[PDB]
Amino acid sequence: EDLRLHLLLNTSVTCNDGSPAGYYLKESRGSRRWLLFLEGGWYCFNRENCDSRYDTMRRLMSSRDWPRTRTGTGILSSQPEENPYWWNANMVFIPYCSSDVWSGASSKSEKNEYAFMGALIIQEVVRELLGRGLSGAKVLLLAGSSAGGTGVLLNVDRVAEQLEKLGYPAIQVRGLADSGWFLDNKQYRHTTITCAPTEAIRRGIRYWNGVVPERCRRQFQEGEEWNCFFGYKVYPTLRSPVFVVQWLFDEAQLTVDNVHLTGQPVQEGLRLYIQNLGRELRHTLKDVPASFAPACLSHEIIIRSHWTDVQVKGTSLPRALHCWDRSLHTPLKGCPVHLVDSCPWPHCNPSCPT
Ligand SMILES: Cc1sc2c(c1Cl)[C@H](SCC(=O)O)NCN2
Ligand SMILES: *[C@@H]1O[C@H](CO)[C@@H](O)[C@H](O)[C@H]1NC(C)=O
After folding, report:
1. 162 alpha carbon to ligand 2 midpoint, in Å?
2. Would you say 292 and 243 are in contact if contact means Cβ atoms under 8 Å apart?
3. Where in the sequence is the active site?
4. Residue 329: Cβ-neighbour burial (10 angstroms; 0-12, 13-18, 19+)
């Protein structure tokens, strides 16, 4: 119960239903490191599917029922035993209550049943934290999992530009995108439920007034900004350092690809499909120097209490992140930052989560 809720003082920056957005904070007075973590949880892209999400996933659309505290876990833990990487940092958990992959900039109005303000929520959290110690930061790591990991890719350079324009050019902004690196590939079977992410994101952008990083927007241009939600397309346009964590066989990727493993022998077509998915993922990370990509069927990593357990080539994620920090002070002896499994099937890495 170590991170305490603060609702935004600017109450025009809202969750989907117009309730104020907010953040959970645990300060560390002896540290100039700040970790701002973006929660995930899919998205919604029209009135009917947002109404459904409001009925049964309301905490992802509203702050009315948020608890006063949350426990920091994994990379948000303040215990070195659980978080060898950044246990002494100032910790911020930003709840995902905008259902827009952190991309929205639209208020609730007579024309809009819901507000989609994810990009503005991040901006406002950063602004309000500057008065609570962030002005003294040396590193701001914008991290996130699942839709929050894609949110990191969409927002890390905007945070960097915001701090520069506010007069804090000494704060180094970096990104950590966990489980948010998706492929716009062919589904295994081509069957809201039938809508593939490219089409759902294309509709969502219009519904949310979604915004993407400027250089990526300039490449893809009007009507094609959905491309910027796909890591391998947006990442090369980014200027801030970004560390990419991605399971090679991510469960959300497989879900959108209409792959459902049961227990029966996988036949040749599905075997080749899965192997090609891992190969394609691995290919997209070849030129990503800071990356951690284990050959596991799983979903998210960084806020799980046992996040320390998985290893790629004998190196854990907390160690790789520590090596990344050292690299941003060429490669370091025994301290690697590019860790992508090459084995071709889920759980060929023995350290995968059970
Ligand atoms: C831009 C894209 S493509 C895609 C996603 C997003 Cl976001 C979701 S998010 C999943 C979650 O939050 O658990 N997973 C599947 N495919
Ligand atoms: C509150 O947030 C809105 C939306 O980002 C912004 O336009 C406005 O200037 C903010 N007001 C204050 C006082 O920060």
Report:
1. 14
2. yes
3. 146 (charge relay system), 250 (charge relay system), 299 (charge relay system)
4. exposed
Structural domains of the chain, count: 1
Ligand 2 atom closest to the CA of 107, numbered from 1? 4
Residue-range definition of the domain harbouring residue 237: 1-354
The protein residue whose alpha carbon is closest to atom 15 in ligand 1 is 252
CB 92 within 8 A of CB 98: no
Annotated catalytic residue, options 100, 257, 299, 341:
299
Q: Whose atoms come closest to the Cα of 201: which ligand?
A: 1
Cβ-proximal residues to 110 (8 Å cutoff; 6+ apart), any chain? none
Distance CA 316, CA 325 (A): 14
Q: Amino acid identity, residue 345?
A: W
Structure-determination technique: X-ray
CA distance 115 to 62: 10
Q: How far is the CA of 131 from the centre of ligand 1 (A)?
A: 33
Probe residue for ligand 2, chosen from 7, 9, 10 as the CB with the greatest number of ligand atoms within 8 Å = 10
How far apart, in Å, are the Cα atoms of 276 and each of 85, 211, 272? 33, 31, 6
- Given resolution (angstroms): 1.4
Half-sphere exposure of 168 (CA within 13 A, CB side): 22
> In sequence order, which residues have a C-beta less than 8 Å from that of residue 261 and are 6 or more positions away?
254, 297
For the question of residue 329 being annotated catalytic, the response is no
